[PDB]
Design an enzyme around this catalytic site. Sequence first.
Site, PDB file in Angstrom:
ATOM      1  CB  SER A  35      37.758  47.058  33.414  1.00  0.00           C
ATOM      2  OG  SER A  35      37.484  45.709  33.798  1.00  0.00           O
ATOM      3  CD  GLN A  73      33.940  38.205  34.203  1.00  0.00           C
ATOM      4  OE1 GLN A  73      33.807  39.033  34.758  1.00  0.00           O
ATOM      5  NE2 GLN A  73      33.395  37.949  33.073  1.00  0.00           N
ATOM      6  CE1 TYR A 117      39.855  43.997  36.513  1.00  0.00           C
ATOM      7  CE2 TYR A 117      40.950  45.584  37.490  1.00  0.00           C
ATOM      8  CZ  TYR A 117      39.934  45.169  36.632  1.00  0.00           C
ATOM      9  OH  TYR A 117      39.428  46.235  35.647  1.00  0.00           O
ATOM     10  CG  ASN A 176      34.536  42.394  36.291  1.00  0.00           C
ATOM     11  OD1 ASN A 176      35.156  43.399  36.466  1.00  0.00           O
ATOM     12  ND2 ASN A 176      34.767  41.696  35.098  1.00  0.00           N
ATOM     13  CB  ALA A 180      39.323  44.375  27.356  1.00  0.00           C
ATOM     14  CG  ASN A 187      40.698  42.491  24.629  1.00  0.00           C
ATOM     15  OD1 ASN A 187      41.655  43.392  24.984  1.00  0.00           O
ATOM     16  ND2 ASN A 187      40.444  41.693  25.296  1.00  0.00           N
TER      17      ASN A 187
END
Length: 358
Positions: free
Chosen positions: A61, A117, A147, A149, A315, A340
Site C-alpha cells: 500500500s 479489496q 480504507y 484498494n 504490506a 509482513n
Amino acid sequence: APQQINDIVHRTITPLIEQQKIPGMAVAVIYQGKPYYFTWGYADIAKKQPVTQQTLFELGSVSKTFTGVLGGDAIARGEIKLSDPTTKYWPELTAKQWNGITLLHLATYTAGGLPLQVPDEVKSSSDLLRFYQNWQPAWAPGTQRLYANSSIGLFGALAVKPSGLSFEQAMQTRVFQPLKLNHTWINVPPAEEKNYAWGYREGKAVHVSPGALDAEAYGVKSTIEDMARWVQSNLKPLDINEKTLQQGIQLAQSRYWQTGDMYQGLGWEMLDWPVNPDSIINGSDNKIALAARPVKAITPPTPAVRASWVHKTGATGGFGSYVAFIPEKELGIVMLANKNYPNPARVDAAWQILNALQ
C-alpha cells in the site's frame, strides 16, 4: 554515517529484526536532506542472497503514495479535477448510487464504503464494470472513511484516462523518470529479477499475485535508494523541475478530511508535528487503520503543512513497508522488509529513530 545516526538506527532495528524474525531489511534515514543507508539479512534465503541497496521490495500500500502523486500531477496538468464526478471518466457507470461520488471520494476512501479489496473473482474488465455498477454504498458520499484498494485503485485508473496512457506508462513517464527512480517498477523486468527479494509468509517464499487494479493500489516494487529519493522529493517538492509534478506532490499532501488526529491526503496520511507517538503508533494498527470512521471535511482543503508527520504503511503477503517524513525538519525514514510484521512495530521504530534525530 554520523555515529548518532548509526547508533539510533542499529539500536532500534537490530532488536526489531530479532523480535519479528525478519529475514531481510533495508532502512534509509534522510537527515538534513541527505540519505544514509542500512541493510541486514537476506533477500533470498535459499540462494543466500543478501539485502543490498539495490534489492527490490514489494511496497504494497505504500504504492498508493505514487498513485496519489500521479493523480495530483494529472490535476496540475488540467486533465482531471478532484471535484469531477466519477461518471465523467467512466460514463458506463450509469447506476444511480454513483451520483455525487467524485474523484476526491475515490482517492480518499470516502465514496461510501467501497470494499477493502476488489473481489478476486473479478478477472476481466467486464467483471470490473459489473462489480462497481452493482456495489451498494453503506453511506452517503463524503461521510465515512473506509480504507479501500477498490477506491484509490479506481481513482488511479480514471486519473490517467485523459492522457490516453496506460497507468504504468503514465507512472513511468510522469513520476518515475523525472525523479530518477530508475529502479522502481510496476512490473519487474527480467533484467532486474536478480535483485527482486522474495517475501516470506509463514516461512514460504512468496511474491504478490496479479489482481484487478493491482498497479494502481499496491503494485510498486522499489529499492531503498529509490525510496530515499522518493522521500527527498516529497520533503522538498519545490526542487522538482517539472512544474506539474512539483504541484502534484503538494496536492497529495494536502489535508482533505480529518478523523481523530489524522488527516487524509492523496495516498499520504498526515498528523500535526509534534505528534503524540501513541497516536501514530497505536493508530497504525490495522484494527484502527482499516475500521469505518466518520470524517470531517476540511473545507477547503489545507495546502501541504510543513509541520506534519507524513506517512504511509504498506504490506503484501510477504512484505512490510513504512515511510514517514517531517518536511519542516528535512527528516525522513524508509523501512523495507521482506516479511509482513505488525504495523505498530514499524511506527514505534520509525518514531524512535526520527525523534532521536529531531
